Amino acid sequence: SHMLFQNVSIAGLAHIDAPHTLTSKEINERLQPTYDRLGIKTDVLGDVAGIHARRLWDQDVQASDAATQAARKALIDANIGIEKIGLLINTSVSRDYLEPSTASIVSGNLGVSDHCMTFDVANASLAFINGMDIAARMLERGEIDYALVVDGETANLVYEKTLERMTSPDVTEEEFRNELAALTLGCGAAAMVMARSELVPDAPRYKGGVTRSATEWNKLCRGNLDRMVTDTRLLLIEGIKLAQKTFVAAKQVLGWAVEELDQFVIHQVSRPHTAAFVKSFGIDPAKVMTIFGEHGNIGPASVPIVLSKLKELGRLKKGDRIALLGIGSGLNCSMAEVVW
Amino acid sequence: MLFQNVSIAGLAHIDAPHTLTSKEINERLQPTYDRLGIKTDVLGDVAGIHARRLWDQDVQASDAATQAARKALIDANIGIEKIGLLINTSVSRDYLEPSTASIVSGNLGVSDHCMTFDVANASLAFINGMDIAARMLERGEIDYALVVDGETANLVYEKTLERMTSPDVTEEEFRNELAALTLGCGAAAMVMARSELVPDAPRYKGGVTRSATEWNKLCRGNLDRMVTDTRLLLIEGIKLAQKTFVAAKQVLGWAVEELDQFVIHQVSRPHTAAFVKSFGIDPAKVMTIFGEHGNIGPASVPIVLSKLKELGRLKKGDRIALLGIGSGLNCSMAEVVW
């Protein structure tokens, strides 16, 4: 068995795209005097990072609100009412308060029953996979019939404040480079209904996968509500090394061979970061969908949003072996498999 | 259906070093007490908090959680390389990203096989963390797990006290920020393990959870502010626990008299007393540290359990109930057989 999940399925899946488009052209327009003062002549966002646009919410939209929208849509996709949900896990980096959990707020909005167990899981960009794993263990045991995993991300504040700091006449080069990665973030939401396979015989199967870590690199990317500081160079270098370890483990327990997988759903930080990843592991780029160019990095929601879009586009066929890959601040790297 | 192969290998707690008494707080609030015409000692006489502990300046949650974790490892007689999972369950947190757990892990020097993340669920998160770890242990995914929790309330005291002594504050502003002055600093950590590795260790049975998420607006807190309505929390919490007991006194075969210890999360002395009274619980079987330490959030339950252990109180076979009502509302009840 290799400790892989049995009889755990995905009954429903949905994503929400934030409505307001913010182009990198517009951002560069604001940053140009700082660019000129700093001697920067290259479009670091559009040409280097490879981000042309990202999406934002309204100011008054909280993480719980975005997650709730995604959740209502996932339930419809699974054709079930909220009364069937026995577990709700929120996995977003963004959060309303220190307490209560964002999950309890979303659950309050949806109207879960008194039997519904809820809490948040936080683990940077890999948290949704952690949420799926935690749910999978309860579903496999048969403690619950259905679970919701939800994730709403809000980057409005970090965009507002970073742009203000970076347009300061007294901003330093170092501070500018430190905070630049925050301008690759985007808003969005995703939700997944998981279920015991007996209940949804034709639904895709979730097997789970492997995790490797490098927690001595926990300082590389630190973020709060209004600010994110990132060592992009070291993230690339140490990320690839960690992914290498995880891939070796993935071949051991998942029996993976790149050419035998049909889709790779990869969490993305930037275009060259992804290209380095794809190249180092000999992956077919035609099996790697990217939304980064127009939506940017949506944290832990990135993986399920891309998966949901793949389904929406009709790219997933019955029998397709789908790899869920990611490197998250930690450092952590998780690799799991979905059989459509 | 309960957990069969899950044990508690190690347990530890950290008491914060600095004492701030309610008498000392009241001296600072006295000019505001003399305005507004307030003559009641709400902290000391009503809430039942006479003191709390604060960390030194610039101590993060991860620092406190790291301290507790080092002690829990020692109590368990294992090195950090044995740990396959580390969960941080604290309300307090260093950043939104990355996890506070990854920072604690980096401090400890966990191996590249160690899985880490945070769990947030108000005062119940430690029990959530124990359950999540318990399931991985039973599946054979890991042999040892660390559940850690450090809380810091230094900033929320500094900020609230600043506000309360401002010349513009009203009687209603004042009252609604007394709740923050019932919080305390502290940290706890637990090592959990597969039972065939630790045959003498206490067994963890798991438990039940009931929720009333319709009341998620009652207690909202951040690092520098907390706003509450304690009165509503009391009635609806107890009502929730009653539903949880129906499930608890069914799945866990629970009967109040046949339980040896009650490790209960405390919001205040009156809240605790009403709970004990409502369910016919022997109050002698309910150890309390609230009077001296205040509310330590989700670390409260493991801290008291650790203190019970250190006292050499618990005996083999003791049936211990971990009980808590958390912001949500959530109510979890679990059993540990010593």
From Swiss-Prot, chain A:
Superkingdom, taxonomy of origin: Bacteria
EC number: 2.3.3.20
Alphabetic keyword roster: Acyltransferase, Cytoplasm, Manganese, Metal-binding, Transferase
Record: residues binding Mn(2+): 20, 58
Active site positions: 99 (proton acceptor), 125 (acyl-thioester intermediate)
Enzyme class: transferase
Entry's Gene Ontology molecular function annotations: 3-oxoacyl-[acyl-carrier-protein] synthase activity; metal ion binding
GO cellular component, one term: cytoplasm
Activity control note: Inhibited by cerulenin.
GO BP field: fatty acid biosynthetic process; secondary metabolite biosynthetic process
Xref: InterPro entries: ACP_syn_III_C, ACP_syn_III_N, Thiolase-like
Location in the cell: Cytoplasm
Keyword Transmembrane helix: no
Gene3D superfamilies linked: 3.40.47.10
Site positions per UniProt: Important for activity: 267
Catalytic activity: a 1,2-saturated acyl-CoA + an acyl-CoA + H2O = an (R)-2-alkyl-3-oxoalkanoate + 2 CoA + H(+)
PANTHER family: 3-OXOACYL-[ACYL-CARRIER-PROTEIN] SYNTHASE 3 (PTHR34069), ACYL-COA:ACYL-COA ALKYLTRANSFERASE (PTHR34069:SF3)
Record's function text: Involved in olefin biosynthesis. Catalyzes a non-decarboxylative head-to-head Claisen condensation of two acyl-CoA molecules, generating an (R)-2-alkyl-3-oxoalkanoate. Is active with fatty acyl-CoA substrates that ranged from C(8) to C(16) in length, and is the most active with palmitoyl-CoA and myristoyl-CoA.
Subunit structure: Homodimer. Weakly associates with the OleBCD complex.
Family that this chain belongs to: Belongs to the thiolase-like superfamily. OleA family.
Domain notes: Contains three extended channels that together form a T-shaped, three-channel nexus. Contains an active site base originating from the second monomer of the dimer.
Name of this protein: Acyl-CoA:acyl-CoA alkyltransferase
Organism the protein comes from: Xanthomonas campestris pv. campestris (strain ATCC 33913 / DSM 3586 / NCPPB 528 / LMG 568 / P 25)
